[PDB]
Amino acid sequence: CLTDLVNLNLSDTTEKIIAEYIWIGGSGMDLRSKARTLPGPVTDPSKLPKWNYDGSSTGQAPGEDSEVILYPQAIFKDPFRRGNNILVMCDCYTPAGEPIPTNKRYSAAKIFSSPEVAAEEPWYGIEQEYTLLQKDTNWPLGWPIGGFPGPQGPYYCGIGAEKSFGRDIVDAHYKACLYAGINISGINGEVMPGQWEFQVGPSVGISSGDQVWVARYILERITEIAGVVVTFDPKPIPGDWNGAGAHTNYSTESMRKEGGYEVIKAAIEKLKLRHKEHIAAYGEGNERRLTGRHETADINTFSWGVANRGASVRVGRETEQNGKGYFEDRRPASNMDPYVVTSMIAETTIVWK
Amino acid sequence: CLTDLVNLNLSDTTEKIIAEYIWIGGSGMDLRSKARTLPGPVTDPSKLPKWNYDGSSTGQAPGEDSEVILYPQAIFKDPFRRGNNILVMCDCYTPAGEPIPTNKRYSAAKIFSSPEVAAEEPWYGIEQEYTLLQKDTNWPLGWPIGGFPGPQGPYYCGIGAEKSFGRDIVDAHYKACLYAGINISGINGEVMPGQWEFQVGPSVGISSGDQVWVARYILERITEIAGVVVTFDPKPIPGDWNGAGAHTNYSTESMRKEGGYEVIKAAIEKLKLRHKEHIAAYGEGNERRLTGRHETADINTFSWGVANRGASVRVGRETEQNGKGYFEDRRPASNMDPYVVTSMIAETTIVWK
Amino acid sequence: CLTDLVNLNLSDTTEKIIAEYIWIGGSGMDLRSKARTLPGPVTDPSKLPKWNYDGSSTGQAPGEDSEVILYPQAIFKDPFRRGNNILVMCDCYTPAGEPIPTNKRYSAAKIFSSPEVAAEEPWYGIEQEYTLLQKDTNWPLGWPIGGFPGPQGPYYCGIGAEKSFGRDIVDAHYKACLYAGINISGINGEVMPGQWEFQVGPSVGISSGDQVWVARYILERITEIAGVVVTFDPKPIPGDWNGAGAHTNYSTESMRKEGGYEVIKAAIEKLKLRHKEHIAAYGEGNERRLTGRHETADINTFSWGVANRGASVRVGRETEQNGKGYFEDRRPASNMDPYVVTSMIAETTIVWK
Amino acid sequence: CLTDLVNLNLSDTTEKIIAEYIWIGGSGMDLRSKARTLPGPVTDPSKLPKWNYDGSSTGQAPGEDSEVILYPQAIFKDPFRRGNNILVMCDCYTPAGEPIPTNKRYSAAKIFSSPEVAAEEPWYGIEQEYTLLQKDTNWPLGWPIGGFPGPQGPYYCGIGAEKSFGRDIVDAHYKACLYAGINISGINGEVMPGQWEFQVGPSVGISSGDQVWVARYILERITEIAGVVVTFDPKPIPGDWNGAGAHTNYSTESMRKEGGYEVIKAAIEKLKLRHKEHIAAYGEGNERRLTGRHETADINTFSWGVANRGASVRVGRETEQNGKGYFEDRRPASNMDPYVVTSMIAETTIVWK
Amino acid sequence: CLTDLVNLNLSDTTEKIIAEYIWIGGSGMDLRSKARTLPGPVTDPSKLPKWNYDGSSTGQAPGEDSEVILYPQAIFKDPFRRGNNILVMCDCYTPAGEPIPTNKRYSAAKIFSSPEVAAEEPWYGIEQEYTLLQKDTNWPLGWPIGGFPGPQGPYYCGIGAEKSFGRDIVDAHYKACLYAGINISGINGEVMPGQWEFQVGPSVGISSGDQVWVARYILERITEIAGVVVTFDPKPIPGDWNGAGAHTNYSTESMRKEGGYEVIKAAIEKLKLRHKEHIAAYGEGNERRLTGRHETADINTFSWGVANRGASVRVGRETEQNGKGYFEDRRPASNMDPYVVTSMIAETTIVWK
Numbered sequence A, B, C, D, E: 001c002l003t004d005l006v007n008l009n010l011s012d013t014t015e016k017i018i019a020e021y022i023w024i025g026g027s028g029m030d031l032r033s034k035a036r037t038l039p040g041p042v043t044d045p046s047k048l049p050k051w052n053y054d055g056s057s058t059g060q061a062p063g064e065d066s067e068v069i070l071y072p073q074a075i076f077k078d079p080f081r082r083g084n085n086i087l088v089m090c091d092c093y094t095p096a097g098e099p100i101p102t103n104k105r106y107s108a109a110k111i112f113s114s115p116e117v118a119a120e121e122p123w124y125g126i127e128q129e130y131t132l133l134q135k136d137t138n139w140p141l142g143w144p145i146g147g148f149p150g151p152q153g154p155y156y157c158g159i160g161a162e163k164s165f166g167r168d169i170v171d172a173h174y175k176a177c178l179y180a181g182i183n184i185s186g187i188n189g190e191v192m193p194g195q196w197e198f199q200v201g202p203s204v205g206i207s208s209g210d211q212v213w214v215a216r217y218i219l220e221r222i223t224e225i226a227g228v229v230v231t232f233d234p235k236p237i238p239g240d241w242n243g244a245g246a247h248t249n250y251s252t253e254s255m256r257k258e259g260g261y262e263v264i265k266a267a268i269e270k271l272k273l274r275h276k277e278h279i280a281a282y283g284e285g286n287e288r289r290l291t292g293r294h295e296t297a298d299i300n301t302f303s304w305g306v307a308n309r310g311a312s313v314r315v316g317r318e319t320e321q322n323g324k325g326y327f328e329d330r331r332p333a334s335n336m337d338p339y340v341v342t343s344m345i346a347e348t349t350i351v352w353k
């Protein structure tokens, strides 16, 4: 029957390939994709033809001038179609070669090409938290309808049927990602029952943004299979329940070398000064998450400390004791555009004075 | 149990083959098929025996003179029975060798054999849109019964459980088709939730028609497996919801060579003059689709433009900028007979003056 | 679909590994785990990097000083993720290298390193009994809701649908454990319908504790898959229904050699004197189990005998008739921390006089 | 069985009475009630004993000083218990005779006792709109779960099963209210499917506030019976669906006498000047309702007109043509405290200059 | 519980009355109603105050000039609210006293006031056929979903569970109507399973129209209670299944007196000449019903005969044999506006020459 067809091995019959072009839609938060057949395997992004789609249907163009252009930027193996088929992360342009307003990759690319940044070779590990929800009722997975599970406490990194909801989805994603070639560093059950996390491990500059988006694309496709819905809303349930963020861990060449801890403090300092303008691009709805309770710092103050999950930035015990490592900006929400957060951190930390 | 039997590998036990003869029924819109055993593998259509069926049961013949004859025309691998078994696309005739009124392949074959057409070597890519429906209630897949989903917008090329209904079926079909040997160029989720699309990529003359029909046959067989119903009705739900069409993309030898864009304009021009008579054969119910809203042009006007999804014909940005390519006739409905549309375009575009 | 992704073989695509760090949480009875990617296979515990987690979320640290450190101590193969992926049993410390109050491995390690203990090379076989419960109602698997099955009698080591509930889970676990490298000696259906047992066979000193914990981790993960709940509560149902214990079988070098039976009696003797203080660490709720009925001895008396399941300690017919073997301390409850019971027995039996 | 007991006629057995004391709770939007037995029928409010309740449980007092006092203010017949039993609308005070912060009846009473207001003898008709919701899912009655009914249009004052949801409840309420002695002037199905309205007809000064609250109490008690939930949230569903308000119709002695239309215009004028401060007390969430679409006027502008449902105030065709009547302030939300809106209008309209 | 409240007898507690004003909405086919309280019983229409409603919500007025006026024209007892409560049939006007375009009572009233018509004192019996449908699926009551019952034949005037669907509703209606004061002459099960009929017996001129509308109002309210949907669509199911009409039986003074049969033939004759223009106002969709099969006459021909259910007009055996009676115009569809058909027959039959 149905899975025999979806899992057909094509290699036995043609050289042809299926490429799934992924892009980001009109809201800056919606992933979209379509697929095309290509005549043979491809490993280099610049050897893939450009393409277009109906921008008038994604809120990015008018009906009379509907075409919007897709620039292939990164290739990953398609864990769904398997064999030689591929996912292609994309960039969006007018037919005139202008990047459209919702393309935030272009700006970020410039910052990561700019040679004083490139030389610092920044590293990002981003911690994507999300929440799983029952289709149609829109209530968190594992929660009874019109009710709540036991209070927070046993859920964080837990095991068992009354504690841990949807490991299925999570472990699936983890391998999918690995197979695809995403640098995924690890996963964990989070504090609010039904909330999970994966980390896209230390990735350089632009490719961090690319990998987080593709990882999210894979997550949602998996949840789609499962008949479950994901939100990246930073505070999906009001009251005594954790919000969800996208912690950004960060380091520069000079931060991970001898006496980098000094560079770290100095970077934090610069961040303190540009808190206000960082918050503004750190994803919407954040006001509902950053309250000072539930392992956040208040939106209005900026703070930092060592093992302090109540602070705006946190520095690992390990990197303190070694005088070198990385720090964690805990401010960005789970619905953060990594392109924006990732480059803005480099900019406020290297370029600006 | 049941799938062990349906998936038996016959190769281990005989040389014998199963051929599924497919034809088009009395309404010109209903596919029909039966199967026979053949003594060994066959790769050439003319080496398959002709056959007959009970036309009195498909509305094509009377009871007392019931026999109607099947001419094998194209072979494809059967993605259901797998191994060496085959699908055989067919043509319909009286025992006297007359093509029956519902055989539109014969006319089309003549036009594509006619040497001034053949030399121009026309190319067609056809975009089959369709809609998936819940068995028995006849309401679109994923829609709640006696109600509607959220308004159009997030569905086009979307991902996730609350957005994307029946990817299962779609991805299955895609591989099925590839395996079978249909030149299928790509797929995508369409604008109305539950509506999808596949494209039968650039195919020459008569074989375009053959492949579209066989692709439709595979689609409906898959939906059958799934316990879901397909309509090719061009406007299945009334009101603020997309209709479904069968866009025909077209090019001639001279159109894809240097300065073909001029030939394109001239062809469009000829099309403008024969709009009235094209509409008449562009599938029934089209009046309900072509309204000027929802990415169509009004039935009564003819128009064209560059990236204009509101026009009767559209010319890609890419082919404009290259002075050579193809244009898209957006007029045909999803229930179009590709034999009719495909040849009628060649006729109005090459032969007539 | 979903199990195709969870069962992806990673070996075909990278050298990378997934390690699941397991630890024991704030209540001393809750297992917790998270996973990370490592660059290649690892077989030695000391070659695994140390790690940390949010102790503020497991009741082990404050929010402002939240980091707690994980020391890898034992590696086993992950029977879930399979291939080269691993489970890593852990130990808990402050960033200052202090063992936290809930780390009972550290104390036990000292006792088993201490050279007069090491030389006696103690052996432990521990019999983990547990009960399976329906999710949400929290009533034993196979029991009708708000009611009881037939009285005890046909359930112990039974077979058939009306007698034996959840063998599925049990047999799964058994192989899981073997695969993982736990020395699991055997399994059996227990006396109360829905209650089962596995034995972690003769294991030396500290590794007994390690293996029991990891075996429990595997059990609960399996039940999680099954949509069923486990309790290690020593007496889950009040009345005429068996409780659950963690019998510890024990032997020293000198006990299993010629005329060890004398050493056995002498050990029992020492145990009689420290009954009071053993009970106190033999797991909470034990008062509800050890009643003198249902194959226990009363908490307040200490007793021993030969084939006597009504005594506090029991000595096998086999080891009596051979003048050498091991004895069974039937006192510990099913929710016993094996680190505590296992070393406390060595201490009261070798060191103290 | 159960309704035989609930409907027992007590008259046949004692003179005793049951009085249900109703009051308004800590949030200023939550009705609360408890019942006591009284020795014989009572018709005058001042002949009912005062009472108290646990304010610490309604967010109105601390635990150590928990008593809050209830002043009977209005009697109505209890339509649930029937016979001679009564509902008693209440007022809230400290034991020291201070009105508590959430008692808005006291202020309003003062304004309606103040002799220049009393002499003008103001009249209020208030139009309570509300929405009916499915228990637990919190989605509007008659809507399919995770979906929407047909667009607005056939619902307003409609009849039939596919159009009209919960008439049951509505018609019940209507008679309940009449029986009770509420001056209820009429009912109607509103624009958004599942939304209804009742009017508390022309009532003088303080008693308008009293009757609206008691009418709301009766409504919710009825929906409680039905196993359905009510919201007075002014905009329960986002998007192309009506919000809900509490239109206040108003007239003074001088407005309903010869050439009152002049007094009306002058009153409107005064209202224009105090729009800002009226909005602030016209119920919370109003920003989400008053948008200028769906028969509201934008929160930021003030406007008036004759038959204009798009304006902030509307004057009936009937009262224009007669040079005398009443005008409709369409600004208050459905969650308005009538005590506050009702007196504030008298104050801005008579006292202030 | 709920029916105790809906059936409260108000007479025991006030003199007050509930009046349900009914009118016809923007489509000319949708009934609408709302209710008001009146101070005492009323028996004469002209003693009821006029009223208004929001025409902007029924498609009859703009938002800025929203008021539309209701003229009470006929009173009937409300069979739902019972006691002294009343239904009030209405007429629609601008505030300027113009009848709105959808008010067809005004025209008809003129024709029935015009003294040469009045003197002929026309009589109408109209046969309302309708179909009952399952809510949400919109498939006829008693039909299995996605299928059909046995072929027509045993359904007409049938009895039994496999033959007769919804008698409940029907018998309820019948008494309701009688109670209300509608001159309802009789009922019967019709030919297509799930289709019924009632007749509004011999009623004079304008009051026929009034009574048919109010009868329809009562029908749909009843079906609403039942959780069932009604259509007056003339041909709800395509194929071998009866359509639904609104046969109009007609007689004038001179037709029911000695040798009226001559006047009858002459009237028929006049009708033959104005068939074309009668058809145009005889309700929309009629083309799908009037086919010449299933007891209709073809739309394009006009015919008459004696006991002929295949003709456009039919004359009873009884009135033929008596040389005096009435004839049956079988042409109007079930969705006919009786005001239009009823007066148009008088006009073509008396006034015009």
Ligand SMILES: Nc1ncnc2c1ncn2[C@@H]1O[C@H](COP(=O)(O)OP(=O)(O)O)[C@@H](O)[C@H]1O
Residues within 6 Å of the ligand: A123, A124, A125, A126, A127, A185, A199, A200, A201, A202, A247, A249, A250, A251, A256, A325, A326, A328, C052, C053
């Ligand atoms: N030097 C570094 N610079 C930037 N990121 C790093 C560095 N070292 C490790 N990381 C990344 O930071 C991430 C932190 O993940 P996790 O263990 O969830 O963080 P936390 O415990 O702070 O929540 C991992 O992706 C890791 O790849």
Ligand SMILES: Nc1ncnc2c1ncn2[C@@H]1O[C@H](COP(=O)(O)OP(=O)(O)O)[C@@H](O)[C@H]1O
Residues within 6 Å of the ligand: A053, B123, B124, B125, B126, B127, B185, B199, B200, B201, B202, B247, B249, B250, B251, B256, B325, B326, B328
């Ligand atoms: N040069 C050509 N001549 C005719 N058909 C072509 C030509 N080039 C491409 N096609 C086909 O026409 C189809 C276009 O489909 P699609 O990608 O859906 O276009 P749209 O932008 O209208 O969605 C594809 O099959 C494409 O391969």
Ligand SMILES: Nc1ncnc2c1ncn2[C@@H]1O[C@H](COP(=O)(O)OP(=O)(O)O)[C@@H](O)[C@H]1O
Residues within 6 Å of the ligand: C123, C124, C125, C126, C127, C185, C199, C200, C201, C202, C203, C247, C249, C250, C251, C256, C325, C326, C328
């Ligand atoms: N000499 C020994 N020292 C420690 N454990 C032993 C020794 N001999 C056997 N065992 C173990 O004791 C356990 C046997 O448990 P089990 O069959 O449940 O005992 P019983 O059923 O008699 O109460 C297993 O751990 C077995 O591997």
Ligand SMILES: Nc1ncnc2c1ncn2[C@@H]1O[C@H](COP(=O)(O)OP(=O)(O)O)[C@@H](O)[C@H]1O
Residues within 6 Å of the ligand: D123, D124, D125, D126, D127, D185, D186, D199, D200, D201, D202, D247, D249, D250, D251, D256, D325, D326, D328
């Ligand atoms: N003179 C008056 N002054 C104040 N309110 C009045 C006066 N006359 C009537 N009312 C009341 O105002 C309320 C408006 O009800 P309704 O007819 O539903 O309003 P709308 O037409 O705005 O829906 C009713 O209670 C009506 O009886």
Ligand SMILES: Nc1ncnc2c1ncn2[C@@H]1O[C@H](COP(=O)(O)OP(=O)(O)O)[C@@H](O)[C@H]1O
Residues within 6 Å of the ligand: E123, E124, E125, E126, E127, E185, E199, E200, E201, E202, E247, E249, E250, E251, E256, E325, E326, E328
């Ligand atoms: N002289 C008349 N004029 C008008 N209607 C009449 C006259 N005599 C009887 N009727 C009525 O005509 C209607 C008859 O419809 P019905 O009994 O269903 O007839 P059929 O057998 O034509 O279906 C009823 O209102 C009946 O009372």
Ligand SMILES: C[P@](=O)(CC[C@H](N)C(=O)O)OP(=O)(O)O
Residues within 6 Å of the ligand: A127, A129, A190, A191, A197, A242, A243, A244, A245, A246, A247, A289, A294, A295, A296, A309, C054, C057
């Ligand atoms: C549990 P936590 O300590 C806090 C993050 C939290 N889920 C949030 O509100 O951002 O996450 P992590 O940073 O260890 O992943």
Ligand SMILES: C[P@](=O)(CC[C@H](N)C(=O)O)OP(=O)(O)O
Residues within 6 Å of the ligand: A054, A057, B127, B129, B190, B191, B242, B243, B244, B245, B246, B247, B289, B294, B295, B296, B309
């Ligand atoms: C979304 P669309 O732009 C328009 C097709 C539409 N479903 C129709 O009504 O013909 O499809 P395509 O051009 O990407 O083929």
Ligand SMILES: C[P@](=O)(CC[C@H](N)C(=O)O)OP(=O)(O)O
Residues within 6 Å of the ligand: C127, C129, C190, C191, C197, C242, C243, C244, C245, C247, C289, C294, C295, C296, C309
């Ligand atoms: C029959 P049993 O003695 C069961 C022991 C009992 N569940 C308990 O409460 O100790 O089995 P074994 O493990 O001792 O062989």
Ligand SMILES: C[P@](=O)(CC[C@H](N)C(=O)O)OP(=O)(O)O
Residues within 6 Å of the ligand: D127, D129, D190, D191, D197, D242, D243, D244, D245, D246, D247, D289, D294, D295, D296, D309, E054, E057
């Ligand atoms: C039809 P409407 O104008 C509705 C206005 C709307 N429901 C709202 O206040 O938001 O109410 P009413 O005045 O007829 O009661």
Ligand SMILES: C[P@](=O)(CC[C@H](N)C(=O)O)OP(=O)(O)O
Residues within 6 Å of the ligand: E127, E129, E190, E191, E197, E242, E243, E244, E245, E246, E247, E289, E294, E295, E296, E309
């Ligand atoms: C039996 P019939 O011809 C039914 C009318 C038929 N269903 C139609 O299409 O008009 O009418 P009657 O019994 O009501 O006169």
Ligand SMILES: [Mn+2]
Residues within 6 Å of the ligand: A127, A197
């Ligand atoms: Mn983390």
Ligand SMILES: [Mn+2]
Residues within 6 Å of the ligand: A127, A129, A190, A197
């Ligand atoms: Mn986290």
Ligand SMILES: [Mn+2]
Residues within 6 Å of the ligand: A127, A247, A328
């Ligand atoms: Mn973190």
Ligand SMILES: [Mn+2]
Residues within 6 Å of the ligand: B127, B197
């Ligand atoms: Mn397309």
Ligand SMILES: [Mn+2]
Residues within 6 Å of the ligand: B127, B129, B190, B197
């Ligand atoms: Mn399309």
Ligand SMILES: [Mn+2]
Residues within 6 Å of the ligand: B127, B247, B328
């Ligand atoms: Mn197209």
